[PDB]
Amino acid sequence: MSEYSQTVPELVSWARKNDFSISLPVERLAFLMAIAVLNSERLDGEMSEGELIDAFREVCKGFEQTAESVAVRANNAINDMVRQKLLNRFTSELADGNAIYRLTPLGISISDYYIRQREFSTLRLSMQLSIVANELHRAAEAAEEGGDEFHWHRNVFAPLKYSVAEIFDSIDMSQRLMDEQQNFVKEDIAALLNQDWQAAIANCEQLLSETSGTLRELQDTLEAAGDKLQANLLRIQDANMGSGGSELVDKLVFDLQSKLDRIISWGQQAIDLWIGYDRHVHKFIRTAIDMDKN
Amino acid sequence: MSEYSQTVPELVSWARKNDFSISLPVERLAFLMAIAVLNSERLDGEMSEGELIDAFREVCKGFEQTAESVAVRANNAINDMVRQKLLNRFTSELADGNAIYRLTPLGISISDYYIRQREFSTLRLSMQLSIVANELHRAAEAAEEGG
DNA sequence: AGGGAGCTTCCAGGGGGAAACGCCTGGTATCTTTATAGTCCTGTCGGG
């Protein structure tokens, strides 16, 4: 079953019928981030209503807002976050009516995008690739050992769906992070050339070389592991075809192979785009420096 | 270094200075989801400007909207998504000026929350604990080996 | 030991005083509506 069981028209009809939307102005986003920071400093991962109100007061202070109606504004903000599926509220009779709050997977993902300083680490990728290689190798050995529907579900499907797929998604996010980093560097090089292009030549060459080395090192690492990961996916596919198959395992393996191809292809494409820019900046600098001679 | 290097007041000041905000109306959110779906069906994880415009046209049809200025409306929506950090645009001289688009980690996280049907699994938890147990065991053996 | 009356102590009853609760009025926040003005597009025509 395609992760997205619905076609574009069906999804559009479904979204339209459920009236989904998200509204996080700077203050609300700051409050969410403050809640995320406060939750990370705690031992129980739970926040009371009073603690959330204190956090809202700090945001309001930070925005230099009137102390009038702050308890009301905090309640409206808390209700808005719950209504927007950012917070889960637990109302227990045992807690004398005091509600307990926890951030939802959505509220966490959003807050982390802004607060977590995510930079591309080669070590991280090498580690992730190591875990997926071991998980795929175990799943391939389990598929080759053969077994019943319970064995194929517990030792092959579960590791592919609940472990390998997650790791591949994490790698794809790391690539999308790298993509944002490249666009940021292009803006910095243009600024350096507008301030003092003569002194900026060494700094621009450093930024171009550091980015190029990183992209290449990454691609080298993906290519080295990619062949072993594909071989293990093929071993699982061959073992599945030999044991009468399972349409669920075949589709899952096909999806993982498609993601792996996307992950490998992205690196080469990013290198070509960076090379085009690098050549252009070098040509520009040479034209600016060397061709005027007086 | 705490994952969140900044205290709450510092973060609030930083957020205020950078002016970060999210506004996701039904139509734009539907367009984002349509883009996310279209990207998942592709082999290269890349979308051209014409393909994004075709996707917007389908959303507009699904919302029963006027076919007038759809190309403009689509450009406004695409620029809004890029301006909101949901899409990364690549403009290469080699591509004769044709821009290539990819969804940002943010645009993906948001689209997946709505489209991905997420339900809890013990098998998954058992596998995750097994992997972490092996990774922690190797790290402990490496720490005990010294170096 | 039983029965009644006196002294002494504690509870019951009265009276005051203010707060709290309940209700209304207006203010403050929030949101919507309405209008205006922009911005861009589209269309037409004419000219090149």
Side-chain angles (χ1 to χ4, degrees):
Chain A
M1 276 187 240
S2 136
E3 281 193 1
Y4 314 151
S5 77
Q6 298 187 354
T7 61
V8 169
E10 286 164 354
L11 202 140
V12 171
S13 167
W14 172 79
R16 188 178 180 181
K17 244 164 185 176
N18 288 294
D19 221 11
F20 299 129
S21 63
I22 297 174
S23 181
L24 295 170
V26 188
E27 178 198 357
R28 292 295 202 244
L29 183 60
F31 180 45
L32 179 68
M33 292 187 293
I35 293 167
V37 171
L38 286 162
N39 197 22
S40 73
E41 293 184 355
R42 287 202 164 197
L43 281 147
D44 295 338
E46 293 173 353
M47 302 193 70
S48 69
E49 190 161 351
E51 289 157 337
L52 292 177
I53 291 168
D54 286 344
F56 186 81
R57 201 188 299 133
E58 276 309 334
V59 174
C60 292
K61 264 186 177 180
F63 279 89
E64 307 172 7
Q65 292 162 355
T66 43
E68 288 178 356
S69 70
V70 168
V72 186
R73 286 160 54 200
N75 277 349
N76 298 5
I78 291 164
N79 287 330
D80 279 350
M81 290 214 171
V82 172
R83 196 167 19 201
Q84 295 186 45
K85 302 205 181 181
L86 301 168
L87 285 169
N88 276 330
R89 177 186 283 165
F90 301 91
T91 53
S92 130
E93 282 196 354
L94 269 131
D96 277 342
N98 291 341
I100 299 170
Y101 296 82
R102 292 181 181 162
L103 283 166
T104 66
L106 180 63
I108 294 181
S109 299
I110 293 170
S111 60
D112 280 354
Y113 175 80
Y114 283 95
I115 312 170
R116 272 189 174 179
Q117 284 181 358
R118 292 162 184 176
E119 296 179 356
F120 182 79
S121 166
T122 50
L123 179 54
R124 185 172 196 173
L125 177 65
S126 176
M127 285 304 313
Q128 287 182 332
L129 288 170
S130 185
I131 295 167
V132 136
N134 273 346
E135 283 293 298
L136 263 165
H137 187 61
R138 266 179 189 174
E141 280 190 340
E144 285 173 355
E145 275 174 4
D148 54 358
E149 197 179 358
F150 192 87
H151 173 81
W152 275 88
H153 183 74
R154 194 179 165 174
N155 299 322
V156 183
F157 181 83
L160 289 178
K161 180 176 175 178
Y162 301 125
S163 161
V164 175
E166 291 288 350
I167 294 165
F168 277 1
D169 292 347
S170 185
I171 291 163
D172 185 40
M173 281 298 188
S174 298
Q175 286 184 329
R176 296 178 192 257
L177 183 82
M178 189 58 196
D179 278 341
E180 279 186 7
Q181 278 187 351
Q182 291 175 42
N183 283 342
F184 204 100
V185 174
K186 289 186 180 180
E187 288 181 7
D188 277 350
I189 289 170
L192 285 167
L193 290 171
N194 271 348
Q195 275 177 359
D196 185 351
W197 71 273
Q198 282 172 352
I201 288 158
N203 290 348
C204 293
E205 282 179 357
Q206 185 187 353
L207 288 167
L208 286 163
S209 117
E210 283 179 5
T211 307
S212 173
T214 306
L215 285 169
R216 205 174 176 174
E217 190 184 353
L218 185 153
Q219 181 61 12
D220 289 345
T221 309
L222 280 175
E223 276 172 359
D227 289 345
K228 283 178 186 176
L229 301 182
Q230 194 65 7
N232 285 330
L233 282 166
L234 276 157
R235 283 171 63 195
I236 295 168
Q237 192 171 12
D238 283 345
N240 191 35
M241 283 188 171
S243 305
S246 166
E247 201 180 0
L248 277 154
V249 173
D250 251 12
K251 200 163 180 171
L252 182 60
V253 167
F254 182 83
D255 286 347
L256 291 175
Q257 286 171 340
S258 281
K259 281 188 178 181
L260 180 59
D261 284 343
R262 224 183 271 167
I263 285 168
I264 294 170
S265 166
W266 172 97
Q268 194 63 33
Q269 276 161 356
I271 286 169
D272 293 342
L273 288 170
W274 192 256
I275 287 167
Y277 177 77
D278 181 32
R279 256 180 222 169
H280 183 65
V281 175
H282 278 81
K283 186 180 177 180
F284 177 79
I285 289 167
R286 226 159 249 159
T287 344
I289 298 167
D290 288 345
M291 291 288 283
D292 197 345
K293 290 168 189 176
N294 57 7
Chain B
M1 276 187 240
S2 136
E3 281 188 2
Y4 314 147
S5 77
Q6 302 179 356
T7 61
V8 169
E10 285 162 351
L11 201 138
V12 170
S13 167
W14 171 73
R16 186 183 175 186
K17 239 173 182 179
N18 288 297
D19 222 12
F20 301 134
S21 67
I22 300 174
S23 179
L24 286 165
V26 189
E27 176 195 356
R28 291 294 201 249
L29 183 58
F31 180 46
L32 179 67
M33 292 188 292
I35 293 167
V37 169
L38 286 162
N39 197 23
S40 73
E41 293 184 355
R42 287 202 164 197
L43 281 147
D44 295 338
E46 293 173 353
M47 302 193 70
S48 69
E49 190 161 351
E51 289 157 337
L52 292 177
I53 291 168
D54 286 344
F56 185 82
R57 201 188 299 133
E58 276 309 334
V59 173
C60 291
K61 264 186 177 180
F63 278 86
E64 306 176 4
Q65 290 161 351
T66 48
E68 291 190 359
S69 69
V70 168
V72 181
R73 290 160 71 179
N75 277 349
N76 299 4
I78 291 164
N79 287 330
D80 279 350
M81 287 206 172
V82 172
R83 196 167 19 201
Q84 294 188 42
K85 303 205 182 182
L86 301 170
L87 285 169
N88 276 330
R89 177 186 283 165
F90 301 91
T91 54
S92 130
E93 282 196 354
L94 269 131
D96 277 342
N98 291 341
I100 299 171
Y101 296 82
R102 293 181 181 162
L103 283 166
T104 66
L106 181 64
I108 293 181
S109 299
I110 295 172
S111 62
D112 279 353
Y113 174 77
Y114 281 97
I115 311 169
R116 270 191 171 180
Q117 286 185 358
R118 296 163 181 179
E119 296 180 356
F120 193 90
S121 167
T122 52
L123 179 51
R124 182 190 188 180
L125 176 62
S126 176
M127 285 303 304
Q128 289 174 330
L129 288 169
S130 183
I131 292 161
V132 136
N134 273 346
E135 283 293 298
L136 263 165
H137 187 61
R138 266 179 189 174
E141 280 190 340
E144 285 173 355
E145 275 174 5

